[PDB]
DNA sequence: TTTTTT
C-alpha cells in the first residue's frame, strides 16, 4: 500500500508537525495494517489530498477515518 | 419506611418548583398532553410516509436542503397550502428575495392569507420569526435560503471583509432563543439551506450545509432533497423527478427515502405518488408497462395512469384510504 | 510527650469543628462511607467496561457530547431506564424541547414515573435541577443540550444582542451551586452537550463544547459519543454502529472507548454487545462468519448469533454472567 | 467565551 498525504502550504502544520504526522500515521497502519508495507508521505502541496494506492473502497475509509482520529489526536501525540 | 419520606420531599419539590416557575413546570412525562407530537402533511404522500409519523411535526424545527433549483422553496409551499387547506396561518419570511406570489397559488397557496416578509438583515429576519412564535398566531413559518440570513454587521461592511462565524453565532443565537417558543406556541418553522461544497474533503462530504451547525441539532426533522431526473411530456419537459431523503428524524425512523414528482405550475404531483404506492401495495397491478386497478385495465405508462386516476375521483378516494389504512404507521385519525 | 499533645489538639479541633459543623464535617478518608465511589449501569455492557468503575458515578457530574444524532439522547435515555429498573426516580430537563414521550416508552424508560421538565429559560432548568437534586428524592437528573441553557437576558433581548460568556458565567455559578448538592444527595447528574466549531485553529480537534469550561472542570465523567457507521437489514437501515470515547474519568482509568449498536426503537443493542464481549472474552468462537458457541454453531452473522442469544434466555443470562465477572475492573461489592 | 467559510 502507498499513502500520500498533500498539506496545502496556505494552511501548514506547525513547524515540525510534518515528520511527527507522518511518523504518527505510520504507525497507525502499522497497527491497523501490519500485513502490507504502509508507507506515507506527508508534504506540502497546492491543495490538501489523501492519495490511496492498492486498497479497497471500504480500506480507503479506514485509512481516511485514520488519519481524522490523527488529526484530531495531534494533541495527544505532539 | 425511607421510601415514603421520599415520596414526601419529592412531592414537596415537585410543589416548590410549580410555584416557583408555574403549574407547568414539572410534571410526570405520562401526563404532559404538550408533549405529544403532532404532525401535518407535507403535500406528498410519498413523504409522510418516509417521515414515519406521517407528516412534519408541530413545534419543531425543520431544516430543508438541497442543491440549485432542487424544489425545496416549492415543497415547502405546497406544505404551507396544505397547512393552510386545514385552516392554519402562515408566514414566509423570504431571505433569498425571490418568492414568486403567482407560482405560490399555483402551487395551492392562499397569498391573501399569507404573511410575506422580506427581511433586511438576518437578524431582523430571526427576530420576526421569534415575534411571529411569540404571538402564537402563526401556525407554520418558512425562513428561505438562510444563508441569505445575511448578519447586520456584514451587511453594513463591505464585500471582502472577513466576518468570522458571525452568521453561524447569529444562528445558534437564534435557535437558543427560538427552540422554547417555538414549542411553546405549537408553531412548526421550516428552515431552507443550501448546500456548500467544503474545500480539501479528506474525512467527509462535500455538501456542507451554511449557517453553521446550531441547525444540524436544533433541526427535529431534516430532508436532503435533490432532483434525480425530468419529467418530459413529450419533448417539453413539463416536471422533475426529485428524491427526499430524510438524513435526520427526532419523530420517527430515519434515512428512509420518497421519490415524486415536481409538476412545474402544479406542484407536486400528488395522484402521481398515489399510482406508485397502490402499485407497491399491490393494490394496482403493474403488468409490465400497463397499469389496471381490480382487473380494470387503467391505462399504460405512469402519466397516462395518473391521468385516469384523474379522471376517477371515487377510486382514488378509496385506493387514498386504504394505502393511508396499512402504510401509515402512526395513524392520528 | 509532644506527640500526645498533638493528637490532644488534633482532637479537640476535630470536635470543635464537629460542633460547629456537624456530626460529617471531618473525619479520616477510611472511615468515610460517604466518600465511596456508587455507580449505575449505562445500559451499555461496553461502556460499563470502558468506565472502569461498572457504570456512572451516583452523585458526580457527567457531560455527554457528540454531533447531531450520535446517540446523546438515546444513551441518556437508556441510563434513565436501566436507572428506573432498579427502582430510582429520574428526572429529565429538556432544554431543547425535543423528546418523544413514545420513543421514551419504547427505550424501556416508565413514562409514568420519569420527572419531565420543559424549561423556559437555562436558569429555570439550572434552578429545577438544583431543587431536585436538594430534595434527594430524585437520583438522576439528564439536563438535555447545555447548549439550550439560553440565559435569561439572552431570552428577553434580541437576536444578535451581544452576550458575551453569560451562559459560561451563568454555567460556572450553577456548577459552585450544585456539585455540592449533588455529592449530598447522591443524585448523578448527566449534562448533555452539543458539539461547536471552533475556529482559528488549523491543528488537533477544533470540536469545542458549549456551556463554558465549568462543565469541563466539574464533570467526572466525559464522553464523546459518535455515531460510527450504519446498522441496516440489506437495504433499510435499522440503527447506528456508535463509539463512546471516555475522554475523561475521575472514578477509573480514561481514554478507554466502547463501541455498541443503537437499533432504532430498541436502544442500545445489549444482546449484540453479550455477542461481542464474549468474543472477546473467548467465550464466542469466530470461524470467520460462523459465530459458535461451545461447539454448538449458533449462528451466521451478527444478527443471527444475536437472534440465537435472544431466543435462549438462558444461555444470556449465564454469558452476561461470566462476562460481568471476567471484564470489570473494579468489581463492586 | 463565542462561532465557520468556500
Ligand atoms: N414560477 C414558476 N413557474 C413554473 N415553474 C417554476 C416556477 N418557479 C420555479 N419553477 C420550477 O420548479 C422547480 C423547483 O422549484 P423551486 O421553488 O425553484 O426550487 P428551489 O430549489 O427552491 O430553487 P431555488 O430556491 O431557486 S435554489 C424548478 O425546476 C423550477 O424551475
Ligand atoms: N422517535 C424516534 N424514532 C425513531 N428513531 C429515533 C427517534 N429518535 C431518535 N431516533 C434515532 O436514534 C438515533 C440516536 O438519536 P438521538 O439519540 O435522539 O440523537 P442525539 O445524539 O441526541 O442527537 P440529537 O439530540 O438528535 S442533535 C438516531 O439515529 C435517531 O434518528
Ligand atoms: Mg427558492
Ligand atoms: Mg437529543
Known amino acids: ?18 515528520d511527527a504526522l507522518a511518523g504518527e500515521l505510520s504507525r497507525r497502519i502499522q497497527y491497523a495494517f501490519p500485513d502490507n508495507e504502509g508507507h506515507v508521505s506527508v508534504r506540502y502541496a497546492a491543495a490538501n489530498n489523501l492519495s490511496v494506492i492498492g486498497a479497497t473502497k471500504e480500506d480507503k475509509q479506514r485509512i481516511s477515518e485514520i488519519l481524522q482520529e ?9 | 419506611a425511607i ?3 421520599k415520596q414526601k420531599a419529592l412531592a414537596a419539590a415537585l ?73 392554519k396561518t402562515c408566514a414566509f419570511i423570504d431571505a433569498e428575495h425571490a418568492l414568486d406570489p403567482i407560482y405560490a397559488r399555483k402551487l395551492g397557496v392562499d397569498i391573501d392569507n399569507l404573511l410575506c416578509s422580506q427581511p433586511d438583515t438576518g437578524e431582523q429576519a430571526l427576530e420576526i420569526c421569534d415575534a411571529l412564535a411569540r404571538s402564537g398566531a402563526v401556525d407554520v413559518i418558512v425562513v428561505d435560503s438562510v444563508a441569505a440570513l445575511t448578519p447586520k454587521a456584514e451587511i453594513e461592511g463591505e464585500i471582502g471583509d472577513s466576518h468570522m462565524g458571525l452568521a453561524a453565532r447569529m444562528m445558534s443565537q437564534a435557535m437558543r432563543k427560538l427552540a422554547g417558543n417555538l ?53 417539453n419537459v413539463v416536471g422533475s423527478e426529485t428524491r427526499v431523503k ?82 401509515l404507521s402512526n395513524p392520528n385519525s
Not at chain 2, 67 to 75: F, Q, Y
Not at chain 2, 273 to 288: C, M, P, R, S, Y
Request: neutral net charge; aromatic residues 8%.
Open chain 2, 15 to 87: 410543589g416548590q418548583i410549580e410555584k416557583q416557575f408555574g403549574k407547568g413546570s414539572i410534571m410526570r412525562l405520562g401526563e404532559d398532553r404538550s408533549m405529544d407530537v403532532e404532525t401535518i402533511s407535507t403535500g406528498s404522500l410519498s413523504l409522510d410516509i418516509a417521515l414515519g409519523a406521517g407528516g412534519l411535526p408541530m413545534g419543531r424545527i425543520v431544516e430543508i436542503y438541497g442543491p440549485e433549483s432542487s424544489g425545496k422553496t416549492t415543497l415547502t409551499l405546497q406544505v404551507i397550502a396544505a397547512a393552510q387547506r386545514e385552516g
Open chain 1, 1 to 18: 500500500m502507498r499513502i500520500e498525504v498533500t498539506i496545502a502550504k496556505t494552511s501548514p502544520l506547525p513547524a515540525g508537525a510534518i
Open chain 2, 3 to 5: 421510601d415514603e419520606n
Open chain 2, 183 to 235: 414549542k411553546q406556541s405549537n408553531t412548526l418553522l421550516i428552515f431552507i439551506n443550501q448546500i456548500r461544497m467544503k474545500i480539501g474533503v479528506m474525512f467527509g462530504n462535500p455538501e456542507t450545509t451554511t449557517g453553521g451547525n446550531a441547525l444540524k441539532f436544533y433541526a427535529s426533522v431534516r430532508l436532503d432533497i435533490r432532483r434525480i431526473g425530468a419529467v418530459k411530456e413529450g419533448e
Open chain 2, 246 to 327: 430524510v438524513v435526520k428524524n427526532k419523530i420517527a425512523a430515519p434515512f428512509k427515502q420518497a421519490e415524486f414528482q415536481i409538476l412545474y405550475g402544479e406542484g407536486i404531483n400528488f395522484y402521481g405518488e398515489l399510482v406508485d404506492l397502490g402499485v407497491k401495495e399491490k393494490l394496482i397491478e403493474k403488468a409490465g408497462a400497463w397499469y389496471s386497478y381490480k382487473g380494470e385495465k387503467i391505462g399504460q405508462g405512469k402519466a397516462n395512469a395518473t391521468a385516469w386516476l384523474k379522471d376517477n375521483p371515487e377510486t382514488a378516494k378509496e385506493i387514498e384510504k386504504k394505502v393511508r389504512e396499512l402504510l
Open chain 1, 70 to 78: 490523527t488529526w484530531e489526536s495531534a494533541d495527544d501525540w505532539f
